[PDB]
Amino acid sequence: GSLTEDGLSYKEKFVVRSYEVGSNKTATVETIANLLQEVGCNHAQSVGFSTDGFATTTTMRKLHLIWVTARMHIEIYKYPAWGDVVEIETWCQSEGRIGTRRDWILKDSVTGEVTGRATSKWVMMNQDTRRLQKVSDDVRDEYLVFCPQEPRLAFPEENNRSLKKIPKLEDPAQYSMIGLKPRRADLDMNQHVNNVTYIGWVLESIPQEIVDTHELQVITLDYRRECQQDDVVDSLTTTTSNDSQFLHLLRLSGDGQEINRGTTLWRKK
Amino acid sequence: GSLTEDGLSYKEKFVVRSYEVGSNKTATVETIANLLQEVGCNHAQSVGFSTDGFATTTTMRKLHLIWVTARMHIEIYKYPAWGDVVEIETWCQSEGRIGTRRDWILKDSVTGEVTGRATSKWVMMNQDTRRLQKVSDDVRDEYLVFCPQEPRLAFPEENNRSLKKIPKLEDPAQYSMIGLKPRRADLDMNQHVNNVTYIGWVLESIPQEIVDTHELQVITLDYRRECQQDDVVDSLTTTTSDSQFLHLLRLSGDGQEINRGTTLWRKK
């Protein structure tokens, strides 16, 4: 991988592995999400930021401040087949004191066609107190030089799905997968549950028949709270709808505390 | 990746990814196991075998025959750091009518030093009846041309760890992790639980303090039965001792054995 000519974005190619594919012999949405994370981390390393998933500066580390994902939105047109080379371009943009946005474009390396796109909203938070805070000018100035200044949106459209408000699923849920627990492979280098694990947990409550006869086109996921290594989660899904749509909720198995909420849109194969 | 000059082995380089590392900033043993699987699959593709993890020929497919792992043995000296390039060489050897053996050597791409080694025993089985077959003659002839004929062993030493008999853990276990279930990410392209998931499940019953103060040096795992997508598993561990543990994975209901193994850990 490498930063592009103007130094305001980063590109990397990946060859889809045998264990990275599903029953269709194409990469799963979790393989895609891991690759978006990988190219994001390589972009942070290329310009001197921390590489632990928190993209900190020396200034942020002294204050115990980290960047955390508030929302992830992914849209896939074609999942790359096993052995295919997918090229991913990523960039970051500040959104004032709200936080930052990281976008991605996925392309087939052979044809050059856009096979997918993703956008994510990030907020700053104290690592220890978990208290959110707006971005200071001193912190902002450290990353503005690595971002394009004119707007560059992976989702430019007026009424695009990436900014839609997600409602809270009401009990009873139509489907559920109960008692989900993370294992050591689900943790990152900081012993925190990887954001991609939550995508897998959301998808666990989708009936196998939907998975066997449909392809996932869009997934939007809001992150409210993190699941600890010793927490137990319940994944809930209700059909909201040629296309199928679902509303999702991940909540702690005991008290029912919300950890995530989201929507999925599936198209008939 | 590519087959070597003599066409009797296969090599491939891998760059360790950010999500592939543990709390030590080095690749986990599950990342290693996935990479061994990947290079094995690429070797099968390179010479015309099936790429679904069963390494079948047109002859085996007609008979509904597959290759299945009976034992996996991995020894790691140095886990590659994130961003490091690890080079892996793999080859296969027939072991008569018993089955086949696939070996691997892991090396640091920068220094050329051997950082690890693995060996695995495979047996032939009918996919549907799950009944073992003592290989054939026409099936054997199909793969002998892709294997070295003189012995080439990743673990040459007589009476080494890779061939040790593993005993059955007795109740009560000293440690346990109960109610483990596979999710869709744990399945392969055939909707079967990936062999690497069982390695993760074995390690789940090792106390966090062992993991925090030790490095895994050797893992030997016997595979007796497959866990279905709707099965629930209990992982049991007892200290036998460097630290050594005896392991058992059994179905949560009836207690039916799915795997047994041993791990050897070194103080950091």
Ligand SMILES: CN[C@@H]1CCN(c2ccccc2F)C1=O
């Ligand atoms: C998570 N958002 C952060 C904010 C700074 N940042 C970033 C900006 C430009 C280049 C590389 C970078 F890592 C992020 O990715």
Ligand SMILES: CN[C@@H]1CCN(c2ccccc2F)C1=O
């Ligand atoms: C599982 N063991 C099988 C038996 C044949 N085989 C093999 C041999 C040489 C080259 C490529 C190969 F796939 C295996 O790996």
